[PDB]
Amino acid sequence: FPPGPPGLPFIGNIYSLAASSELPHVYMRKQSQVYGEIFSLDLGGISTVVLNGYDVVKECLVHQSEIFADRPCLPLFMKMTKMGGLLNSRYGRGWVDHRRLAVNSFRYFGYGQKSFESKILEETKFFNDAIETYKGRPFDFKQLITNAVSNITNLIIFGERFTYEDTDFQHMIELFSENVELAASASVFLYNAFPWIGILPFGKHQQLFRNAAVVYDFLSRLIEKASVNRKPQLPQHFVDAYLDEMDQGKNDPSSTFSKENLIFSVGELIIAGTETTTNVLRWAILFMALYPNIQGQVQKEIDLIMGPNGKPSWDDKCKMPYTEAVLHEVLRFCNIVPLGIFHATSEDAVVRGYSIPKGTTVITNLYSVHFDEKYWRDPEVFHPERFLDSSGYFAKKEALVPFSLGRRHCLGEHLARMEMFLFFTALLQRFHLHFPHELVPDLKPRLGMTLQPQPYLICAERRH
């Protein structure tokens, strides 16, 4: 069983993570330098194993894919979803059924259709128009980016987009997003260690359970509004398709599709899309205002390939290596999902001599892969040029894994990439981005299951 740093009795390394000035993924990378690529932590009595660097992360999630495909049975995840749904589903027939349905649905109701790309572009127009509203005055992009990004998924799930005046839906996403953040909280690591803490009426765990209630109700209401006009066997979207599957499993009682599992799946798909993609864009914008020379080079490429008023296109990607370079270097350098989503072993495992008992939490420290000095030159530097080959084309790197690897890898990778590219290009084509009174902006990320920047104002002035 892998060695690791010691911590106090009862609470273990929750203390050492807690009392460290460094964020958890940074903490963990330093400890691998002392204990090895694979080390352990005692998180209040839950034994967890951390994987660090590209080699062991691959060795587990890819070479032993079925053994590390599971999710851990932490009290919070048992309470929230009973380990059904998709994202936190146990590895099994339930997960196979939901994953398959989701993959096919995103293909069929999404990027598999010729008209889909223009629906993204339609959204960049609402988005850019909303930006113009402010007439170059400083504001926070967080809301608009969130609205716009979530609508690309709303099309696939609910068959429609919600307007930017829809503050009810926005409120539901703000609570759900708070929950993704509180999930990384010391309060929650303790709650999972000591679930009797649930008797305590105050604290971040009660905020999370309350939020989850409000969110669960809202999602079931949306799912009901989206199933009104349903024509059995002729689905308009993911919700209809899910209901199709419940029909075909009415006689199969071991069928895993359920009304509860539909709310969990929809919630998981919606929050997975909105949290992550939004943040990528928010980091990118931050860095383009910080480094105008880099912003300007992207803009130069846009004008050469797309012109001043051309509609951006997914097909343009491969004529725009520098743009693709910047975007990949944001994924690598900001690590929007720094520790991925926790895994667990689906059976007793043996990795590099160490034994890992069935059910152990396994943390894949994706941050440490992107800063693995065996595969990256000076990874502590933001430098898009590292993704360019000697002819100036985009050069893909094996050790860039911001959508993780193996059986559980991001289901939305492709969709995210189109969203990112089309939103970033549409925005930079129309605007110049800089800070107010050249304010000194903060680049220290906010502690959560995803990394987002602190609130920052930005000025968007039209270019032509």
Ligand X SMILES: C=C1CC[C@H](O)C/C1=C\C=C1\CCC[C@]2(C)[C@@H]([C@H](C)CCCC(C)C)CC[C@@H]12
Using CB under 6 A as the criterion, which residues of the chain lie in contact with ligand HEM when the complex forms? 86-87, 99, 153, 268-269, 272-273, 276-277, 280, 336-337, 340-341, 402-404, 408-412, 415-416
* Of residues 186 and 290, the one with the C-beta less far from ligand X: 186
Phi then psi for 364, rounded to 5 degrees? -95, 110
Stretch of residues binding ligand X (CB under 6 A), selected from 106-114, 164-172, 251-259, 262-270: 262-270
Give the residue nearest to ligand HEM (CB): 412
| Residues 6+ away with beta carbon under 8 Å from 118 | none
Nearer to ligand X, 179 or 346 (CB): 179
Q: How far is CA 446 from CA 92, 182, 272, in A?
A: 34, 11, 18
Which residues, 6 or more positions from 240, have their beta carbon under 8 angstroms from its beta carbon? 159, 226, 227, 230, 231, 234
410: annotated binding-site residue? yes
**Residue selected from 305, 341, 418, 459 as contacting ligand X according to rule CB under 6 A:** 341
Residue 342 CB, shortest distance to ligand HEM, in Å, is 8
Residues 6+ apart with CB under 8 A from 444: 454
Buried b / exposed e over 146-157, threshold 16 CB at 10 Å, is bbbbbbbbbbbb
Does position 361 bind ligand X by CB under 6 A? no
What residues numbered 393-452 form the site for ligand X, per CB under 6 A?
449-450
User: What residues form DSSP beta bridges with 166?
Assistant: none
Nearer to ligand X, 271 or 433 (CB): 271
344 near 359, Cβ under 8 Å? Answer: yes
Contact code string over 84-113 relative to ligand X, x by CB under 6 A: ---xx-------------------------
Q: Which does 412 bind (CB under 5 to 8 A by kind): ligand HEM, ligand X, none?
A: ligand HEM
Rounded Cα–Cα distance for residues 305 and 283 (Å): 24
Tell me the per-residue interface mask from 165 to 184 with ligand X, x by CB under 6 A, - otherwise.
Answer: --------------xx--x-
Residue 179 interaction partner, one of ligand X, ligand HEM, none, beta carbon < 5-8 Å per kind? ligand X
275 binds ligand X (CB under 6 A): yes
Residue 280: contacted member of ligand X, ligand HEM, none (CB under 5 to 8 Å, by partner type): ligand HEM
212 is in an annotated binding site: yes
- The interface partner of residue 428, options being ligand HEM, ligand X, none and the CB cut-off 5 to 8 Å by kind, is none
Choice between 205 and 430, CB closer to ligand X = 205
Chain length of the chain = 464
> Which option in ligand HEM, ligand X, none does residue 333 bind, with CB closer than 5 to 8 A by kind?
none
Name the residue nearer to ligand HEM (CB basis): 336 or 458.
336
The residue with its CB nearest to ligand X is 267
Distance of CA 114 to the CA centre of its chain: 26
Smallest separation (angstroms) from ligand X to the CB of 276: 5
Q: Which stretch binds ligand X (CB under 6 A): 92-100, 194-202, 266-274, 423-431?
A: 266-274
User: Binding site for substrate: residue ranges?
Assistant: 212
Instruction: List the binding residues.
Output: 212, 410
Residues that bind ligand X in the complex, under the rule CB under 6 A? 76-77, 80-81, 87-88, 179-180, 183, 212, 215-216, 219, 263-264, 267-268, 271-272, 275-276, 337, 341, 449-450
Summarize the annotated binding site for heme as residue ranges. 410
